[PDB]
C-alpha cells in the first residue's frame, strides 16, 4: 500500500508511486550474497605445529634428568 | 663405611653462539652414619662425571654432628637462601619423617628418628645446605655444660 502525494499533479504522483513500488521490490528481493566460512591458514596451522614441537623439545629437556647412568 | 646418596641430577644450559650447551649438575651427600655428613654439588658435561665430582667434593666437605642415639639433641632451625628447615628429635621408632633432600642428608648423617619440616623454598641444593646448617647449629648437652661453666647434670637436671 503506497500513498504518493508529493506533487500537485496526479501523473507525477502516479509515476512516483510506481517508482516507490519498483525501488521497494528491488531492495526487498535483492539477495544478500552468501558468506562461506573461512578456515585458518595452513601457514598458521604449521605455525601451531612448529610452536608445539619447539615447546615439546624444551619440555623434554626440562625437569627430571632421571636414569642417572649410575 | 661411608654411605653416599645422589639427591638430584639437573640439566643446565649455557646458550653459546652456536646454540645451547647442556651440562649436568649433580648433588650428593656422603656420611658415615654417625654424625659426619657432607654434601657435594659437582657438575660436568656428562651425568656420571658430574656424580663423581659431587661425591669427591662431598667426601672432603664433611662436618661433624653431635646427635643423641640416632636422633637430634633438641629442635633446631637451619635457614639457607629462602629454604627454612625445621628438624626436631623423635622417639626411637619414628623413622626419618622428612621431605626430599632432607631425608638423604639425615639418612647418611645417621639421624634415624627425626620430625623435620621444610619451609619456604624447597630447592634441593639450598635445602641440603639448610639441613646441614641446622645440624651444625645443634648443641649437645656436654657442649652446653662446657659453654656455661656447669655440670651436665646441673644443666639437664
From TrEMBL, chain A:
It is found in: Cytoplasm. The keyword Cytoplasm applies. Keywords: Cytoplasm, Hydrolase, Translation regulation. Residues 61-70 have a biased composition (Basic residues). GO terms for cellular component: cytoplasm. Its EC number is 3.1.1.29. The keyword Cytoplasm applies. Residues 30-70 are annotated as: Disordered. It comes from the Bacteria. It catalyses: an N-acyl-L-alpha-aminoacyl-tRNA + H2O = an N-acyl-L-amino acid + a tRNA + H(+). Coiled coil: none annotated. GO terms for biological process: regulation of translation; rescue of stalled ribosome. GO terms for molecular function: peptidyl-tRNA hydrolase activity; ribosome binding; translation release factor activity. Associated with 70S ribosomes and polysomes. Belongs to the prokaryotic/mitochondrial release factor family. This is Peptidyl-tRNA hydrolase ArfB. It comes from Escherichia coli. The gene is arfB.
Automatic annotation (TrEMBL), chain B:
One of its GO terms (cellular component) is cytosolic small ribosomal subunit. One of its GO terms (molecular function) is structural constituent of ribosome. Residues 2-65 form the S5 DRBM domain. InterPro entries: Ribosomal_Su5_D2-typ_SF, Ribosomal_uS5, Ribosomal_uS5_bac-type, Ribosomal_uS5_C, Ribosomal_uS5_N, Ribosomal_uS5_N_CS, Ribsml_uS5_D2-typ_fold_subgr. One of its GO terms (biological process) is ribosomal small subunit assembly. Keywords: Ribonucleoprotein, Ribosomal protein, RNA-binding, rRNA-binding. Transmembrane segments: none annotated. Pfam families: Ribosomal_S5, Ribosomal_S5_C. Belongs to the universal ribosomal protein uS5 family. PANTHER family: MITOCHONDRIAL RIBOSOMAL PROTEIN S5 (PTHR48277:SF1). Located at the back of the 30S subunit body where it stabilizes the conformation of the head with respect to the body. Part of the 30S ribosomal subunit. Contacts proteins S4 and S8. The N-terminal domain interacts with the head of the 30S subunit; the C-terminal domain interacts with the body and contacts protein S4. The interaction surface between S4 and S5 is involved in control of translational fidelity. This is Small ribosomal subunit protein uS5.
